[PDB]
Curated annotation (Swiss-Prot), chains A, D, J, L, P, T, U:
Molecular function, one GO term: identical protein binding
Effect seen on changing residue 33 to E: Loss of self-association
A GO biological process held by the record: positive regulation of CD8-positive, alpha-beta cytotoxic T cell extravasation
Localization of this protein: Cytoplasm
Domain DED: 3-81
Domain-level remarks: Contains a death domain involved in the binding of the corresponding domain within Fas receptor. The interaction between the FAS and FADD death domains is crucial for the formation of the death-inducing signaling complex (DISC).
Pathology linked to this chain's protein: Infections, recurrent, associated with encephalopathy, hepatic dysfunction and cardiovascular malformations: A condition with biological features of autoimmune lymphoproliferative syndrome such as high-circulating CD4(-)CD8(-)TCR-alpha-beta(+) T-cell counts, and elevated IL10 and FASL levels. Affected individuals suffer from recurrent, stereotypical episodes of fever, encephalopathy, and mild liver dysfunction sometimes accompanied by generalized seizures.
Tissue: Expressed in a wide variety of tissues, except for peripheral blood mononuclear leukocytes.
Part of the intact protein present: 1 to 84 of 208
Top-level taxon: Eukaryota
Protein name as it appears in the record: FAS-associated death domain protein
Keywords: Apoptosis, Cytoplasm, Disease variant, Glycoprotein, Host-virus interaction, Immunity, Innate immunity, Phosphoprotein
Species this protein is from: Homo sapiens (Human)
Annotated effect of mutating residue 44 to R: Loss of interaction with CASP8. Abolishes induction of apoptosis. Decreased interaction with FAS
Subunit structure as annotated in this protein's UniProt entry: Can self-associate. Component of the AIM2 PANoptosome complex, a multiprotein complex that drives inflammatory cell death (PANoptosis). Component of the death-induced signaling complex (DISC) composed of cell surface receptor FAS/CD95 or TNFRSF1A, adapter protein FADD and the CASP8 protease; recruitment of CASP8 to the complex is required for processing of CASP8 into the p18 and p10 subunits. Interacts (via death domain) with FAS (via death domain).
From Swiss-Prot, chains B, C, E, F, G, O, Q:
Protein name, UniProt field: FAS-associated death domain protein
Domain notes for this protein: Contains a death domain involved in the binding of the corresponding domain within Fas receptor. The interaction between the FAS and FADD death domains is crucial for the formation of the death-inducing signaling complex (DISC).
Record annotation: effect of changing residue 12 to R: Loss of interaction with CASP8
Disease: Infections, recurrent, associated with encephalopathy, hepatic dysfunction and cardiovascular malformations: A condition with biological features of autoimmune lymphoproliferative syndrome such as high-circulating CD4(-)CD8(-)TCR-alpha-beta(+) T-cell counts, and elevated IL10 and FASL levels. Affected individuals suffer from recurrent, stereotypical episodes of fever, encephalopathy, and mild liver dysfunction sometimes accompanied by generalized seizures.
First and last residues shown, out of full length: 1 to 85 of 208
Domain DED residues, every copy: 3-81
Origin superkingdom: Eukaryota
Gene source species: Homo sapiens
UniProtKB/Swiss-Prot annotation, chains H, I, K, M, N, R, S, V, W, X:
Functional summary from the UniProt entry: Apoptotic adapter molecule that recruits caspases CASP8 or CASP10 to the activated FAS/CD95 or TNFRSF1A/TNFR-1 receptors. The resulting aggregate called the death-inducing signaling complex (DISC) performs CASP8 proteolytic activation. Active CASP8 initiates the subsequent cascade of caspases mediating apoptosis. Involved in interferon-mediated antiviral immune response, playing a role in the positive regulation of interferon signaling.
Organs and tissues of expression: Expressed in a wide variety of tissues, except for peripheral blood mononuclear leukocytes.
Quaternary structure annotation from Swiss-Prot or TrEMBL: Can self-associate. Component of the AIM2 PANoptosome complex, a multiprotein complex that drives inflammatory cell death (PANoptosis). Component of the death-induced signaling complex (DISC) composed of cell surface receptor FAS/CD95 or TNFRSF1A, adapter protein FADD and the CASP8 protease; recruitment of CASP8 to the complex is required for processing of CASP8 into the p18 and p10 subunits. Interacts (via death domain) with FAS (via death domain).
Effect upon mutating residue 51 to R: Loss of interaction with CASP8
Localization per record: Cytoplasm
Entry remark concerning the domains of this protein: Contains a death domain involved in the binding of the corresponding domain within Fas receptor.
Residues of the full protein shown: 1 to 86 of 208
Effect seen on changing residue 44 to R: Loss of interaction with CASP8. Abolishes induction of apoptosis. Decreased interaction with FAS
Protein name stated in the entry: FAS-associated death domain protein
Domain annotation DED: ranges: 3-81
Effect of residue 38 to A: Loss of interaction with CASP8
Length: 84, 85, 85, 84, 85, 85, 85, 86, 86, 84, 86, 84, 86, 86, 85, 84, 85, 86, 86, 84, 84, 86, 86, 86
């Protein structure tokens, strides 16, 4: 399997609904309003960002900034362990 | 390619379901019930209005009226930017 | 652009869910149960009443009676303003 | 053009699918089961009833009864306007 | 117009979805499983029962039993009104 | 005209596609595959059965068995009315 | 030219293929199987019936029976108009 | 009139093209190819069978076998009715 | 002008080729094969039957039987009209 | 070159097989069966009608009736132009 | 030149083979078989009728009956013009 | 190239199947059932109307009525451009 | 009348042109080309066979072989009936 | 009528769409993809299984295995009742 | 009107959501997860149990055990009354 | 080798049966029925026309009229090339 | 009658159009294209194979191979029944 | 071989049925109905237009107009390539 | 009579029109064009070949080559049976 | 025997009836109608041309022109082989 | 019937919708987007993976990885029992 | 195997139904209404655009504009890789 | 037997009706219209081309061009094998 | 019979309609539009490719490319087994 897809699945498995709403608000300017209605979990948002080339195996600045804004410093360690 | 179609696509891609329902209610007297049953997004309604000669690159009064009735003042800026150029 | 539809939309935009339930109860003897099951907002009820010729641009008694029963006196002023002009 | 055909087309243009199903149920005793399977809009039903001499430019009682059973009075107003 | 079909249409117009599911459950031994999958309203079930010679203008006992099981005593009054006249 | 042909035409005019498919399956052991490929309505199947002497005015048992297997008790009444008179 | 041939041509010009197949089935006892294979329109069948003395200007009962069996009550009016006037 | 020729004419007047093709195939070992090329109806085949002494007013077994093979049980009744006239 | 020849001409002018072939088949026992080869219309067959005394202006049973076999009931009316007129 | 023959050729050149069959049915009481079996185009039927004095340069009523029965109103204009 | 012979030549020049056969059949009772076997054109039949005193310049009923039987109404106009001119 | 045929081809190229069904219904009194069974596109209907002298370069009222009944106001502009 | 000549006439009266052609081909090694050119019916061939003593009221083997080759089994019955009659 | 076909029709009239899809998946190794594309009810699959000699009046193991895999123990009773009668 | 289906309908009409969830948990080992996902009332579960030959008119042991596990002793009286008669 | 006979042979070598039938119909008033029965190709008709002094090396109007009536414009060019 | 021709007729009477197309494809290297164009049923193909001496009353390997490739075993049973006797 | 016929064959080998029907509609004023009934591919229409001198090796305006009406801009390039070489 | 003629008659009795056309094409370089116009069946072609000394009761190679070209392997067995019988 | 007569026999032995009719038409201006009525094969025509000194063993131009008109280029090779 | 198809059916009949969505996400780089839209149950995904030669009776590593990623350790026991 | 067709197939294999609907709306002015009704995947639209000379191996501006409008920036990388590789 | 005639027969045995129609179209300038009506197979066209000296055993360029235009590359190999064998 | 035809039949028996449409698109530049319009199964496409000499028992590269493009790796195993076992 692709180590990146496993990392994204593990990250999305550890979020609640309120953090999903905060992420949807923070991603307001990049994704259209019609598409944001269909987002019910983190996997859909990650798929859209992957399709728009906002997230790549090697370009993880946007994900790091979003996690820092959510004040979740335990998932950043997982991201860093994957990168290293 | 035809800038009017691009503008209509951009306007349509920024609506939710409730606003589409309000638009369908507001356009009740111009489109028949059987045709209105088949509308699932804004593109279909815009296509019907284009066919009936209600929307033209020079006649945008109906679109402005509908958008002002929906209280969406950010799309009116896009329409004004298109017409200005 | 029909102003009666605009007035109905504006009136429907100011109701909550409990008032909608009260209106559905009050209109129990005019609309069937299966049709009432599909009503989620005021626009659907107004569409049904328009179809049954219970609500007309010249006969607005039923709407006034419903609003008076709901103790909503700020919407009767809008109805009066519409029928004055 | 014949005004009667225009009136029938205008009436048929304002029906949904559920009302068509109700009309097909109500016309169960006059049309056979093989023919009713080919009806997709009101035009086919009106053509069959025209062929069987149930609808005529002078006799419109069956249409009025069906429209009264569907509780559509705005269409009955159209029929009254045509007759006058 | 056949009055029996009018009565059946009027009865079917006053049911909800859960009562339809209960009626489908109660008719498990008379209709096959493949045919019950296509029933979306009461008209289809009534048509099937009419074809299988379970419902007749002179034989209305099964309909009365089903209505009594659903605890709808207002529709039984309509059935009695039809039969008496 | 022949009453038997009128009866067969009346019976064939009341079937649908799925019932025709079921009849074609049930008549697998009497008609060949190449001949069954040409059957589009009930008239063709009845003509073939008439040719093979499986269906006569004095012998209507196979038709009764097929109709009973389709659970159509409103056509057996027609067959009984024809035979009684 | 002969008012009868014009009437027959007018009647035949208003039939589709399914009605032709129904007529061919109903006329199974009067015309042979080899001759019925050559029939593609109503004119051929009418010519055969004219030759066999089944259809005459003074005897039109079989035509009325066939048209009644097809439930085409508008062509019966044409036949009446021809006979009356 | 020969009650046999009338019967043969009546039988031939009730066949289509596919049944004629099937009969021509079944009669492949008795008639030559050049003669079978000229057959367009049942009469043209019955004439050859009469000439070759395969079909007689008292020997009708081949006709019954062919009709049974075609599964036409309503014509065997006509043949039986003719035979009952003796 | 013999009313019989006019009647025979009128009857012969209303037949197609398939009816002629059927008539040729039905007369297989009265006319030879070599003479039947030369028949192209109904006039030749009527001439041969007249020569062999099968058809006379007073005896017309064979013609009616053939016409009934062909199921042409509109020519039997012409024959009846001729018979009743004389 | 006779004007009438050219007109008949022009009229015959604009018909299909179904119209030929309808004309053969409509001309059933005037021509015998044996002769009608030989007709494959309009020229043969026109020749047979010419021989029987049904069609002449001064009497064109039968042709007009046939064309009116076939609902071909564009050839009646040609006939009228020839007559004028 | 004899006008009657010119008229007969004009009439005979406008016939086909089937019409000649029909005329020969209709003239069966007047001319013998052996003499009818030699006829290949209308001129021979007209010559035989002239010899038997059946066609005369003024006794022209048989020709009219034959032409009416053949349904040739355009040659009757030629005959009428000949009679009216003289 | 006759401009009228080009105009008719352009008009027919912009219709769908449901509009074709409505057009067939609206012409019930002018064309017989047997001929209407063989119509699959607008070209056949236009050919029949051309033959019956209902549609000619100087008379285009029936086409305007049909297009107005179908509520297609973008093809009436094409018709007007042709006429001018 | 000679019964043998009557039998030969009856047999020749039931043949067609193609069968005559096949008979001429089969009799190629007994008659010359110039004589075979003159044969138009079966009587001419029978006469030439008679003159050469190939056909005798007691020796009918060649005729039987020809008829068996043509697959005409209904004329062999006629020949057998004639032989048993004597 | 044949009891086996009646039993198969009765069994087929008691299945929904999900069960049909599961049966189509379970019969993947015996029927080709193009043929499985055309199956819309149970009769279409039973016909193919009958043609391939996987289902016979007495070889009912595959049907029982499929019904056991679908966990339908009310139809196995019908199968047992059918088998016990014979 | 099968007395058993009526009994099951009456029993199902007297349950709430928590009891339905408890029954779904207790029936974990006999029904698959994908099918238990679709259960919304007692009728759906009873249909599956009837299909798998676990519940029969002569064998009501599993139903009695499930009812006893919920401490619903009033419904056991209904079951006993049905069994007695 | 008279050029006129060669030209007539070349023209006759390019006609089918239907065109021959049309020519026979158009030449109905100039040649008798008994003579027209014998025509099987264009050479016979051309010989019959030559015998009656209707077709000459100087007077070819009838040939041009017939060819124009058949709508064959590639043979009129051959005639023009011969004449010039 | 020849037991072999009857067997071939019985085999040919139980094939559809698709199987005929597959047989024509499989017999591509034995029969020419112009002759394969004229084949409309199985009888023509069997006649051609009989003429080319590929099918004989004692040599039936090609027929068995073709039937095996079509996956029709009920017809191989018929061939076995013929050969066993 | 003639380049023009090869070009026409190549153009005709790239059309469907609907395009052929559209061409038949667009060519209503140049070819009669009886002739247009016989057209089943583009080769027949090209043959008729060649006979009427509407299509020539030096005059190709009608073909370009038809191809522009059908909106086929890939075949116009083939026509231009043919014309450039000559 | 002569076995070779019987064999040739039997072989020619099993051909059709298309096979005769193919044989005429294949024998193009041996028989002149004026003589091939008169051939209507195989007997005429066989007679011509017999006259030209291409076919003899001991030299049958050309016939075998023709039959092998037509792919008629059932007639080669008849030829082999004739050759082995003598 | 004379080689010229053998060559003429060989040439005549390869012509059908239609080619004979075409040759008779082409030789219309040299032989009378009554003499042409009696020709049934090429030998008669060649003998008639021989009597008139139109065909000689040193002057074969007419034969070459006739054969080239019939488009028989395989017989011209035989003629050339005889001449060489 | 194949012990492998029975095992796959048993595994598929024990999954819910959210697990199916997660499995669809994890197979993003092996199946195209157009084909993943038609997947409504596990049987379709298993059929696609069988056709692409990703699942065989001897190669069960991908299924084990997916099941371990879903944290379903009760189905891995079924897989092990099948293999043993 | 024409790399351009492979690229178009790969691009079409990565779209869904909604994106196809938006593409159909954006290509509203270049394809007629009758033709757009027959489009069920990207291959049909690509075929029409290839015929109308809007897509060529050297001209890919329209495809890039459509992909940019759909906001699919991963397929533009495939297009750029194809262009750079060739 | 002449190898060239056998080769032409083999080539003609593998063509269908549409290819024959295309071949007739491609030879519009070499054969007249009256002669092309009588062509029903490839043998007639080959015979005409042989007569006009367009097709010789040593000159086979036109046949190669026609077969290349039909895009039938499985027959060009047969032609090459014939040429290499000689 | 031929092992190659059996292999092609087996490969064609395991395709659906969408894969057939994709194959038709991928084979756009090798077959004409009018010919591609007549393809309803894989057998027709394989027959056309066999005629054009694109597919041979010794050359199977195009088939492998097409199958790899459809991402069907279970049929490539069958192709490899055929090539290795022979």
């Amino acid at each position: 399997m692709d180590p990146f897809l496993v990392l994204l699945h593990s990250v999305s498995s550890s979020l609640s609904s309120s953090e999903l709403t905060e992420l949807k608000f923070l991603c307001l300017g990049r994704v259209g309003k019609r598409k944001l209605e269909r987002v019910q979990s983190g996997l859909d948002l990650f798929s859209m960002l992957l399709e728009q080339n906002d997230l790549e195996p090697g370009h993880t600045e946007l994900l790091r900034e979003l996690l820092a804004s959510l004040r979740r410093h335990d998932l950043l360690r997982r991201v860093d362990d994957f990168e290293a």
